Ligand binder design. Structure first.
Ligand SMILES: [Ca+2]
Ligand SMILES: [Ca+2]
Ligand SMILES: [Ca+2]
Lengths: 127, 126, 126
């Protein structure tokens, strides 16, 4: 249960002094994921739907490397640069979480995100 | 395993989220905005009225989970106007009077769901 | 079971909040802004001085709680200018040298308490 690191080449390499996720006392604390394609290191196109899809795939990669799944996510925070993009984010986020007990959640409009991203999603999960 | 909290005394979750999730003895509440649960609409565009509603909604979630506000360990206050901090704080202080005050973070954001002026997220012991 | 952390070497908790709460083996720290506890006033608008003051304040909380920065699992960095990310990162990296870096999220918010450039919230094992 002591603090352990999660590292996978299937999620973006850390672009700063942080770990992709930390497991501790049965909780996986994921870094906020932005819409970087892990294979190229580039932000995907300036399109909220494509970016939401990329973020959720990056989160999934972190969960898999930790040996857990999206069904175990307890709580998320959505940081978006335009509150009017909430519905398009929700429409895809729901697809990802369909059939699970939906996590608790907060959504707020931020003024800017790393690399000019439109959305960043942070999750905590059970291990 | 995680378990859901659902009560008609708190605003219906529209987006693909649960009002709160309990896991390993901790209640993770969704951020509450100043919705009247009976209508789904925000209350008046007044920071004091909205803060009061948020806290009522939080109370309803805690009660359904079988816990209380004195078990809250940490909150985050998201407000659209940092100049409203004093008014939010005084109502928040009255809500927590007589308890060990939670840890807290406060930030100003440029917008909130439904055009709310305030959104408060809490974590509690169950 | 929840317990308060209080130290005169972090900014006085004016009003309804605790500097940090410990519960079930986790330290939930309040977000720290660059108030100098020696003066009670905010540090000048130099992102490096403010980031160092924030980390000094976090250090004081960890010390009083009987834990260390090696046990931090997650931080959130709220900044008023995303262009300050690099300067914050370099200081934050020196701070965490020799530890497994925490999980993290960094976002630019519309404003912070007292007009601060940076607020950092941490979660740690006790
Ligand atoms: Ca859909
Ligand atoms: Ca200790
Ligand atoms: Ca900016």
């Amino acid at each position: 249960n002591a603090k352990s690191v999660i590292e996978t080449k299937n999620a973006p390499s850390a672009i700063g002094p942080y770990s992709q996720a930390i497991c501790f006392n049965g909780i996986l604390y994921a870094s906020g994921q932005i819409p970087i394609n892990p294979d190229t290191g580039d932000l995907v196109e300036n399109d909220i739907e494509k970016q939401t899809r990329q973020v959720l795939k990056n989160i999934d990669a972190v969960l898999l490397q930790a040996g857990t799944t999206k069904d175990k996510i307890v709580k998320t925070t959505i940081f978006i640069t335009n509150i009017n993009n909430s519905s398009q984010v929700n429409d895809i986020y729901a697809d990802y979480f369909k059939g699970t007990i939906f996590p608790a959640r907060s959504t707020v409009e931020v003024s800017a995100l790393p690399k000019g991203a439109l959305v960043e999603i942070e999750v905590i999960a059970g291990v």
